[PDB]
Amino acid sequence: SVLTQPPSASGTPGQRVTISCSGGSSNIAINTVNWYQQVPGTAPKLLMYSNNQRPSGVPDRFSGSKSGTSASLAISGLQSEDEADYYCATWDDSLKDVLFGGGTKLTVL
Amino acid sequence: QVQLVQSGAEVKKPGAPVKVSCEASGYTFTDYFIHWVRQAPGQGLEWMGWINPISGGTNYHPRFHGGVTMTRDTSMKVAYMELKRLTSDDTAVYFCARGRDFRGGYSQLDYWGQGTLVTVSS
Amino acid sequence: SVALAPHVGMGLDTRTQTWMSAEGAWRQVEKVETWALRHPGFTILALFLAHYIGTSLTQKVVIFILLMLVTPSMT
Amino acid sequence: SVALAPHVGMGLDTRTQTWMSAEGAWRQVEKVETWALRHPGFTILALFLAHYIGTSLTQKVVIFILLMLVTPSMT
Amino acid sequence: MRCVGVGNRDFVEGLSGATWVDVVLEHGGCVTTMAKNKPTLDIELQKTEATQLATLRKLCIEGKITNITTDSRCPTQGEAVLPEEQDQNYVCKHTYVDRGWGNGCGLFGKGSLVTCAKFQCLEPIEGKVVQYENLKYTVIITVHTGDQHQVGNETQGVTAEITPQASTTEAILPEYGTLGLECSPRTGLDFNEMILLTMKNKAWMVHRQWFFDLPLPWASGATTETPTWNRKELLVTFKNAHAKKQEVVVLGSQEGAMHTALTGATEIQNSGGTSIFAGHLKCRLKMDKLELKGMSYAMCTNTFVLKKEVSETQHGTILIKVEYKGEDAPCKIPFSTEDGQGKAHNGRLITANPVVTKKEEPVNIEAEPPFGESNIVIGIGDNALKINWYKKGSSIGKMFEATARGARRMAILGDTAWDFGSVGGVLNSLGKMVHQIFGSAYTALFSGVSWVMKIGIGVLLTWIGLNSKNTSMSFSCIAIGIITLYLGAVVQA
Amino acid sequence: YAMCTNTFVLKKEVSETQHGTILIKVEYKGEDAPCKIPFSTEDGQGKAHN
Ligand SMILES: *[C@@H]1O[C@H](CO)[C@@H](O[C@@H]2O[C@H](CO)[C@@H](O[C@@H]3O[C@H](CO)[C@@H](O)[C@H](O)[C@@H]3O)[C@H](O)[C@H]2NC(C)=O)[C@H](O)[C@H]1NC(C)=O
Ligand SMILES: *[C@@H]1O[C@H](CO)[C@@H](O[C@@H]2O[C@H](CO)[C@@H](O[C@@H]3O[C@H](CO)[C@@H](O)[C@H](O)[C@@H]3O)[C@H](O)[C@H]2NC(C)=O)[C@H](O)[C@H]1NC(C)=O
Ligand SMILES: *[C@@H]1O[C@H](CO)[C@@H](O[C@@H]2O[C@H](CO)[C@@H](O)[C@H](O)[C@H]2NC(C)=O)[C@H](O)[C@H]1NC(C)=O
User: Fold this and answer.
1) Helices (H), E365-446
2) Given a contact as 3+ CB pairs under 8 Å, which chains touch D?
3) For chain A, which terminal residue's Cβ has fewer other Cβ atoms within 10 angstroms, N or C?
4) Any chain C CB within 8 A of the CB of E277?
5) Exposure of E403 by Cβ count < 10 A (0-12 exposed, 13-18 middle, 19+ buried)?
6) What is the b/e burial string over E316-340, where b = at least 16 CB atoms within 10 angstroms of the residue's CB?
7) What is the phi-psi region of residue E101: left when phi exceeds 0, alpha when psi lies from -120 to 50, beta otherwise?
């Protein structure tokens, strides 16, 4: 299989918006998902270095987990500086390669 | 600190091999991975292949076996990737990232460099 | 380690083939064969033991075949 | 390897310790013993086979020990 | 119809008193059943899903020794302890080292030393047990309606799922009546001593007794994020160099080790819950309510054309795809078989009474012609059709193939194999009891003994019977030996 | 009491007791009056009472 996540829009007032990542029975349903956000034009940083563990990203407002075949991320208190493209990447074990997603154009008003 | 210089961006012509150097110092380079993820303009970034500096071979993405090659040296702690064939398709900036050897950490790309950029034209 | 003692004969019979029937059908005999080709020395000892313990023909041949099977496997 | 033919008994030994001696000393033996305690059914057949083959207690004992040892190690 | 030329499907004919026929539904294969007057039908088992699993004894097939510590004590001063000894994550042993004035101890001799290390786990391989409460089988029954898109089609049919609680089930058919199933899942495959083992994206079924004796670290399987692993010493290995110091290694990962180990296990593809394939199940067919569906219909007289050429299967079965001409009545196509220059009807029509429900869509008529020359007639008119076909097989060859198939079925299904075509009778029950006693004796006596040992023991037993004067013992042991050869040759499949 | 005339259903599975005995727990959904539970044992390919 292959993962596909949708691009979506949001607003600068704080609200829970869910970046859902959908996969299959061999790539993400058994393995740890990894969440990336990139400021456009430069090197993406890592947002979640485990399934639900953040190394140094904006704390207490970026938290998410995965359920079965789906992984999701939740952001709270999203302001304008959070304008970024969000990536979910999971390790595929059947094809012995990591499976990066197409990308979300998360625009915040 | 630990970082990757990734040398400087260079652009060439089709039908010739180009090289992208990628040095990461500041830590024991042997244990950790190098991933070489490509990123196209206005497109999502896809990962291609690991290189274990100590004993590792190329494990490219299925799209890219026989399209790229990866080498490394342990003394200078640098990983080399070169493009054996430049078509019109590969017009993007190629990255480096440190990866863990954990099964849950194959996608663990904690640190990234600047990003060496290469485009092809006449 | 765990690589030893497969449950080849575990007896949970099924119609479809197993995980690795093709290799596992012959891997043990392959090990014995490659061990024998590597080391010819044990053949003389096995022949000597069988000849000087085997009272009859059948006893001698059984002793020889068992000795030639056990040692490569016990290696 | 397939971990079925350990690099043992090559003769090129030295005072220094091997890669793994404390465990490889008893690995194969423990496999045989856990097999035997798990499945006693083969013991009856081995006893019969050793007993009805031409019987001098030397022959019976060696046949029984070999036959009970070979099947576990080489399944 | 669904079962045409697939997995050596057979046809079990005949019905007992009150019309129950016993059938064991081997998975990966299927059966068809003709009747005295009732329409034939084929049953195939598939997708024996098992849901709502429970996890116990998750093992660990990799290590990562992160923190290492050591301590020494002078000779004749007791064993040197280490503060990092009583934690629930450290594994170590005591070894002896020689100490001198060059090492800081005044007394010469052998001294104690320890080297303890924390043991992170990586890549756990969880073990899952299945309970009979949530188990579900699924058998698809297809009637021989002779549809255009019915041959070899895995989609057509009606699902009649069965559970170990509700054993009985009545499959509803489209205007054919009800079929009564009395299958018993508590026999056949036994999941009480079978444990599903899932690692990475692959799964397996291993006998429970064998799933605790394979040497690896194991844990409670409570997924509490801090598993305190029992028997950590087995994976980590200490090496002591020539006297002197002591160091610790990790011994890599056991991935391919486990993949090699599970040689005799089957495969169970788990995507949602688990979908255990390679199953086995015994069934009973209460066939009272099977309408022939063609009692009122009449034998039409219009001509018939065929779409594709006559074709046969592996068995004695030919598949004919005929089409009906310009008469609007949905009729009952008659059928007959003829010989070369004479007129003799012997070819059995394997399917039910074929009926052309609609003018446009063809019907797939399949039947069993006799050996040798065969002529086929597809109507009452002089110019209906003539299908001449030559069958290759011979009667003795057919009997030999049937005996081979029966022996193969007996090898896998064992004591319950008598139930496959069993029609209620004393002789089948007597053979069932006798073979059950003998099979219990045989499996108990040969348990875990592999195929090469089976064939060796068999040939040795045959020889010991070939050189004996005790006649009764000779024949008993030679029979056991021949059976042993056959089981050794057939096993692994 | 009278004998029941409606259906039964298993709330929980059956299980042995290392003595050759079963514990079948049955719920009676039929709204009718308290009735004696009918029982019979069907042997293999036989109607005999064992
Ligand atoms: C092995 O399998 C992989 C896929 O699993 C094959 O990768 C395929 O590679 C071709 C060319 O390298 C890709 O075509 C490209 O598609 C993009 C889509 O936007 C298009 O824009 C390009 O112009 C180009 O046509 C193809 O998509 C890709 N398949 C994928 C990614 O699923 C690979 O070629 C195989 N190797 C063999 C057969 O030796
Ligand atoms: C196995 O059985 C399925 C189930 O019927 C078969 O699928 C069927 O396929 C045919 C054509 O391939 C469909 O015919 C339909 O005809 C109408 C009118 O001409 C047209 O409008 C439709 O677009 C379609 O072509 C039929 O509906 C379809 N049955 C369904 C969907 O239930 C299948 O062909 C059989 N064989 C195999 C090998 O699967
Ligand atoms: C056991 O090993 C761990 C491995 O990291 C050590 O933890 C480090 O301790 C040093 C000393 O203070 C710190 O500077 C590091 O930041 C620690 N690393 C981590 C990841 O915590 C330490 O030697 C031991 N840890 C114990 C005993 O808890």
Assistant:
1) 395-413, 426-445
2) C, E
3) C
4) yes
5) exposed
6) bbbbbbbbbeeeeeebbbbbebbee
7) alpha
